[PDB]
Design a protein around this ligand. Structure first.
Ligand SMILES: *[C@H](O)[C@H](C[C@@H]1CCNC1=O)NC(=O)[C@H](Cc1ccco1)NC(=O)[C@@H](NC(=O)OCc1ccccc1)C(C)C
Ligand SMILES: *[C@H](O)[C@H](C[C@@H]1CCNC1=O)NC(=O)[C@H](Cc1ccco1)NC(=O)[C@@H](NC(=O)OCc1ccccc1)C(C)C
Lengths: 306, 306
C-alpha cells in the first residue's frame, strides 16, 4: 500500500536522448531509428525568435549546421525536414537502443512521465498531466527543450509530448511528436495567455478511490447524487463536467471499493462545498487531479512493464 | 521554472533488477557484478514468518533452491551467504549492465528515488525520504520486496535502500544494501510500531526557498528570529530541531534568493502558527518536507547525470 506520484521507469527513453546544437542554440533531441526529432525553434537565433518564418529559416540551413551528440559519439546529419513544429534530422546511424514505440496524441486529463533533459543528458523523471487548457505544470529550465513525455504499454513507449516553451505564468507548452502544439500556442516569442484552467473531475474521483483503497475514508458519506446535480456543483467550483463515459471508466475502481461512482460524487460535492477542514487525503491537503483511473489501478495493483 | 517531486532517471537500476524465487516466495533481487542481493526473508515459509532463525533456515538451503530470473535468462546460483538481513546470491554470470555503484547508508531527512519492481520488472519510479522515525512513505505491494532506493552522483548509483516490509500504519521499512535495517525494525512478522514521526525542518525551509526561486512569495515577511526562539516553535509543531549545520547547508539557497536563513525561519514560524489561510505554495496546501536543500539546488538549476 501507499500512493505516490509515480513515473514510468525511464530507461527505454534515456537511450534515445541526444544533444542537438545549431548556431548558439543547444537543446535535446529524440533519436529513434535514424531520425532525430527536436523542436524546430533550434534553428532560431536570438533575433529570429520574434516572428520567424521557419520555412525560410530551415531552407536557409545545411546538414552540417546541425551538431548532434549521442554522448561522445557525434552523429552525422544526412538530411532534414520539418513536420509542423518539429524538425526531423535524418542521420546515418540507426539508434541501436531504439525501443518499440508509437507517437500518440493525448487528450486533456491524461497523464505521462517526462524525462527532463539537458545537453542530451537525463536530469530527472516526473509525472504530469495535460491540463484542460493544454498546458502542463512541469519543471523545465533553459536547455530542457526536446525533453519528451511518454507512457509505457508493457514493452512499447508511447511518446506524447515534446517540450518547446514556458508561458509567463510558469506553465509549459509543447507538441506531440508529429509537431502539433497542444492548445492554441505557436512557437513564437509573442505574448500568449494559457487560457483558464479547470480541475480534472474524473481524476479527482479516481484519486478519492485510491484513498479508499489505501484506508483514507474520513471523507465518504451516505449521500448520493445524480450526474446532473453533481455537474451543477462541478461548474461552480471550476471542475471538468463529468460524463457518463467518465462514470464508465470509474467502474473497475467502483466495483473494487464497493462505492458507487455517484456516491463518490456526493463525497466530492461535500469536500468541494465544505473543504477538507484541516485533514488530508493521501498526504495532500488539496484535491489532487493528476492521477487517471488507469494510474490508480496500475499503482494500486502492481502493473509492470517489460 | 516549476517544481516537481522529481526522481532520478532509473535506467541504470532497471538493468540490475532480477526475479528471485525460493519456495513459494518470489521477490526482486539487485544483480551487481556476479552477486544478487535480496531480502533474506525470501527463505521464509508462511509458517516460518513468525520468529524465524535465519541462520538455521539458510545453512539448510541449497544453491539450487534459488531461482533467479534475468528476464528469460535463468541465472545459476554458485554460492550464497547472508550479511545481516540481506541474502547475497553468488551467480556464475556477472551483470554486463552493472553501473558504477556505491552502497551508502543515508541519514533521516535525506531523499532517494525508488524503482518499484515486481517479478524483476520495474513498475514505476518515485521520490521518497527517510523519515525521522526511519520509515519511508512509499508505494509498495506484495511482491515488491527487493526493490531498491538510490541516488545518482554524475555517473555513479549510490544504492541506499532495499524494501522488506510494510508496517501497519501503511508505511514501509527496510535496509541499506549491507542488510542493516533503518530504525529499530527486524524482519519478523511481529507487532512493531514505527514511532512518532516529525517534520523535517531543514527540508521545509529548502522547499520554501524553491518557492521563492519560482515566484511564490506570498509567505515572506519582514520579521527575523534567532535559531533558539525558532526551535522553541519547532518543538511545539512537532518539527525537527534546526541546527547551525542545517543553517549552513541552506546558505547557497539563502544567497541566491537574498533571504537570510533566519528570515525564512521567521516565515515558517508564521506559517506554523497561522496556517496557510487557504493558499498554496508550489501547488501544495501543506508544508512539504521531502526536498533536501540539494534536491532544490539540483532541480532549480538543472543538474544532469551521465
Ligand atoms: C528551450 O530549452 C526553452 C525552455 C524554456 C526556457 C525556460 N523554461 C522553459 O521551459 N524554450 C525557450 O526558450 C523558448 C524558445 C522559443 C523560441 C520560439 C518559441 O520558443 N521560449 C520560451 O519558452 C519563452 N516563452 C515565450 O515566448 O512565451 C510567450 C511570451 C510571453 C511574454 C513575452 C514574450 C513571449 C520564455 C523563455 C519566456
Ligand atoms: C515483500 O514483497 C513484502 C512487501 C510488503 C507486502 C505488502 N507491502 C509491502 O511492502 N514484504 C512482506 O510481506 C514482509 C515479509 C517479511 C518476512 C519477515 C519480515 O517481513 N512482511 C510484511 O511486510 C508484513 N509486515 C509486518 O510484519 O509488520 C509488523 C506486523 C504488524 C501487525 C501484525 C503482524 C506484523 C505485512 C505483510 C503485514
Amino acid at each position: 500500500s501507499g500512493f505516490r506520484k509515480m513515473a514510468f521507469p525511464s530507461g527505454k527513453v534515456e537511450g534515445c536522448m541526444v544533444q542537438v546544437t545549431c548556431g548558439t542554440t543547444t537543446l535535446n533531441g529524440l533519436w529513434l531509428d535514424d531520425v532525430v526529432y527536436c523542436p524546430r525553434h533550434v534553428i532560431c537565433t536570438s533575433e529570429d525568435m520574434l516572428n520567424p518564418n521557419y520555412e525560410d529559416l530551415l531552407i536557409r540551413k545545411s546538414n552540417h549546421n546541425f551538431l548532434v551528440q549521442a554522448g561522445n559519439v557525434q552523429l552525422r546529419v544526412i538530411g532534414h525536414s520539418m513536420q509542423n513544429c518539429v524538425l526531423k534530422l535524418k542521420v546515418d546511424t540507426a539508434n541501436p537502443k531504439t525501443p518499440k514505440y508509437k507517437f500518440v496524441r493525448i487528450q486533456p486529463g491524461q497523464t505521462f512521465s517526462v524525462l527532463a533533459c539537458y545537453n542530451g543528458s537525463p536530469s530527472g523523471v516526473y509525472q504530469c498531466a495535460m491540463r484542460p487548457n493544454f498546458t502542463i505544470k512541469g519543471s523545465f529550465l533553459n536547455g530542457s527543450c526536446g525533453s519528451v513525455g511518454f507512457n509505457i504499454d508493457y514493452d512499447c513507449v508511447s511518446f506524447c509530448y515534446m517540450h518547446h516553451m514556458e508561458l509567463p505564468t510558469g506553465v509549459h507548452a509543447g507538441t506531440d511528436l508529429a509537431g502539433n502544439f497542444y492548445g492554441p500556442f505557436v512557437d513564437r516569442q509573442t505574448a500568449q495567455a494559457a487560457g483558464t484552467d479547470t480541475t480534472i473531475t474524473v481524476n479527482v474521483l479516481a484519486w478519492l478511490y485510491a484513498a479508499v483503497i489505501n484506508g483514507d475514508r474520513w471523507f465518504l458519506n451516505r449521500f448520493t447524487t445524480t450526474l446532473n446535480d453533481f455537474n451543477l456543483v462541478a461548474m461552480k467550483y471550476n471542475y471538468e463536467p463529468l460524463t457518463q463515459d467518465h462514470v464508465d471508466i470509474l467502474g473497475p475502481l467502483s466495483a473494487q471499493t464497493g462505492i458507487a461512482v455517484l456516491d463518490m460524487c456526493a463525497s466530492l460535492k461535500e469536500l468541494l462545498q465544505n473543504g477538507m477542514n484541516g485533514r488530508t487525503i493521501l498526504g495532500s491537503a488539496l484535491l489532487e487531479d493528476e492521477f487517471t483511473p488507469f494510474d490508480v489501478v496500475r499503482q494500486c495493483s502492481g502493473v509492470t512493464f517489460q
